[PDB]
Design an enzyme around this catalytic site. Sequence first.
Site, PDB file in Angstrom:
ATOM      1  N   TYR A 203       0.821  -1.233   0.000  1.00  0.00           N
ATOM      2  CA  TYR A 203       0.000   0.000   0.000  1.00  0.00           C
ATOM      3  C   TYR A 203       0.848   1.273   0.000  1.00  0.00           C
ATOM      4  O   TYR A 203       0.424   2.301  -0.533  1.00  0.00           O
ATOM      5  CB  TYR A 203      -1.034   0.038   1.150  1.00  0.00           C
ATOM      6  N   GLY A 204       2.043   1.197   0.582  1.00  0.00           N
ATOM      7  CA  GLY A 204       3.036   2.250   0.413  1.00  0.00           C
ATOM      8  C   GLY A 204       4.152   2.161   1.428  1.00  0.00           C
ATOM      9  O   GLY A 204       4.907   1.188   1.449  1.00  0.00           O
ATOM     10  N   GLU A 205       4.276   3.202   2.245  1.00  0.00           N
ATOM     11  CA  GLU A 205       5.168   3.188   3.397  1.00  0.00           C
ATOM     12  C   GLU A 205       4.540   4.023   4.491  1.00  0.00           C
ATOM     13  O   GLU A 205       3.995   5.088   4.214  1.00  0.00           O
ATOM     14  CB  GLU A 205       6.539   3.800   3.075  1.00  0.00           C
ATOM     15  N   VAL A 206       4.605   3.542   5.728  1.00  0.00           N
ATOM     16  CA  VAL A 206       4.473   4.430   6.861  1.00  0.00           C
ATOM     17  C   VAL A 206       5.867   5.016   7.052  1.00  0.00           C
ATOM     18  O   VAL A 206       6.838   4.277   7.166  1.00  0.00           O
ATOM     19  CB  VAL A 206       3.978   3.711   8.123  1.00  0.00           C
TER      20      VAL A 206
ATOM     21  N   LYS B 149       1.283   7.286   6.401  1.00  0.00           N
ATOM     22  CA  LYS B 149       1.155   6.290   5.338  1.00  0.00           C
ATOM     23  C   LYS B 149       1.042   7.005   3.998  1.00  0.00           C
ATOM     24  O   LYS B 149       0.346   8.008   3.890  1.00  0.00           O
ATOM     25  CB  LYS B 149      -0.058   5.384   5.555  1.00  0.00           C
TER      26      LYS B 149
ATOM     27  N   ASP C 129      -7.148  -8.756   9.840  1.00  0.00           N
ATOM     28  CA  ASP C 129      -5.762  -9.253   9.717  1.00  0.00           C
ATOM     29  C   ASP C 129      -4.891  -9.039  10.964  1.00  0.00           C
ATOM     30  O   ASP C 129      -3.830  -8.439  10.911  1.00  0.00           O
ATOM     31  CB  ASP C 129      -5.100  -8.637   8.496  1.00  0.00           C
TER      32      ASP C 129
HETATM   33  C1  LIG Z   1       3.955  -0.408   9.578  1.00  0.00           C
HETATM   34  C2  LIG Z   1       3.852   0.627  10.634  1.00  0.00           C
HETATM   35  C3  LIG Z   1       2.766   1.399  10.740  1.00  0.00           C
HETATM   36  C4  LIG Z   1       2.757   2.397  11.818  1.00  0.00           C
HETATM   37  N1  LIG Z   1       1.764   3.193  12.075  1.00  0.00           N
HETATM   38  N2  LIG Z   1       2.078   3.990  13.137  1.00  0.00           N
HETATM   39  C5  LIG Z   1       3.318   3.666  13.580  1.00  0.00           C
HETATM   40  O1  LIG Z   1       4.007   4.067  14.506  1.00  0.00           O
HETATM   41  N3  LIG Z   1       3.749   2.547  12.607  1.00  0.00           N
HETATM   42  C6  LIG Z   1       4.919   1.789  12.506  1.00  0.00           C
HETATM   43  C7  LIG Z   1       5.974   2.009  13.359  1.00  0.00           C
HETATM   44  C8  LIG Z   1       7.127   1.259  13.255  1.00  0.00           C
HETATM   45  C9  LIG Z   1       8.231   1.534  14.179  1.00  0.00           C
HETATM   46  C10 LIG Z   1       9.471   1.218  13.807  1.00  0.00           C
HETATM   47  C11 LIG Z   1      10.557   1.531  14.755  1.00  0.00           C
HETATM   48  N4  LIG Z   1      10.290   2.168  15.945  1.00  0.00           N
HETATM   49  C12 LIG Z   1       9.102   2.457  16.233  1.00  0.00           C
HETATM   50  C13 LIG Z   1       8.069   2.182  15.441  1.00  0.00           C
HETATM   51  C14 LIG Z   1       7.195   0.288  12.275  1.00  0.00           C
HETATM   52  C15 LIG Z   1       6.136   0.074  11.420  1.00  0.00           C
HETATM   53  C16 LIG Z   1       4.985   0.823  11.529  1.00  0.00           C
END
Ligand SMILES: Cc1cc2n[nH]c(=O)n2c2cc(-c3ccncc3)ccc12
Length: 259
Positions: A12-15, A30, A119
């Site tokens: 879907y993209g990248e957060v 996102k 999911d």
């Molecule tokens: C995939 C995803 C969606 C998201 N939405 N809100 C958020 O914080 N994340 C994420 C936060 C991290 C993260 C990585 C390293 N250290 C802290 C948070 C990783 C993925 C996500």
Amino acid sequence: WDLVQTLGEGAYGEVQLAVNRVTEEAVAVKIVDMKRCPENIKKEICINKMLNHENVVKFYGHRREGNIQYLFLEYCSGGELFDRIEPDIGMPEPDAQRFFHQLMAGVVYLHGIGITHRDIKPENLLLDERDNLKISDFGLATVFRYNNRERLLNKMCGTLPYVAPELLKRREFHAEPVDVWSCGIVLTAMLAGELPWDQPSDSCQEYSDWKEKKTYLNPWKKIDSAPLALLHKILVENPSARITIPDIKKDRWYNKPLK
Ligand SMILES: Cc1cc2n[nH]c(=O)n2c2cc(-c3ccncc3)ccc12
């Protein structure tokens, strides 16, 4: 707002992480390029605008800008619950239990306003700074109750090892017990450090061994009888025999005080 690092890509993209220059606030973004989707991305916003809970990743706003869509989402600085499950170990039973509770409060709330995440897995259970759990990503979520009238589901969505067996057999099925099953594969992951099976299917020796009650095998043998007593009720093939969140809330191990 300005984009600091890249938190979790995929499809879907990248957060991406974004810190604001002046205000001293950072909150994830996102990024969805519709070239593929436009009718789906509006459904996630629809459903996000509905949600407001201490165990669900808050939504803030969004800016369409050409082909690009930006969903402004609460930043969860403790990362994923995926990265706190140690392979073939899992985690301390008292940490497992604390997370299950907060996980049942997030889904109890979703189900009460008629959403089903669809999911649920550790990758989609983020954590904040005090390590409170948050349900993340509603771009596969959907409305299984509207105006007090429940609609059964039929589309295959999810991830194969967390998905419920009726979602591969039954042509129509209730959304609640599919979330209850996913949440039990997540309980086995938190206490066993492996996922029991590819898919709850029939030419799959591992699931067929569970139904035969061979708990003398992985992953079940790394789990203590109290919380294995509860998994016995959640991972049941037949959805109407399966346990419900109000009857999880009365489970022996769910209310057992753990050190
Ligand atoms: C995939 C995803 C969606 C998201 N939405 N809100 C958020 O914080 N994340 C994420 C936060 C991290 C993260 C990585 C390293 N250290 C802290 C948070 C990783 C993925 C996500």
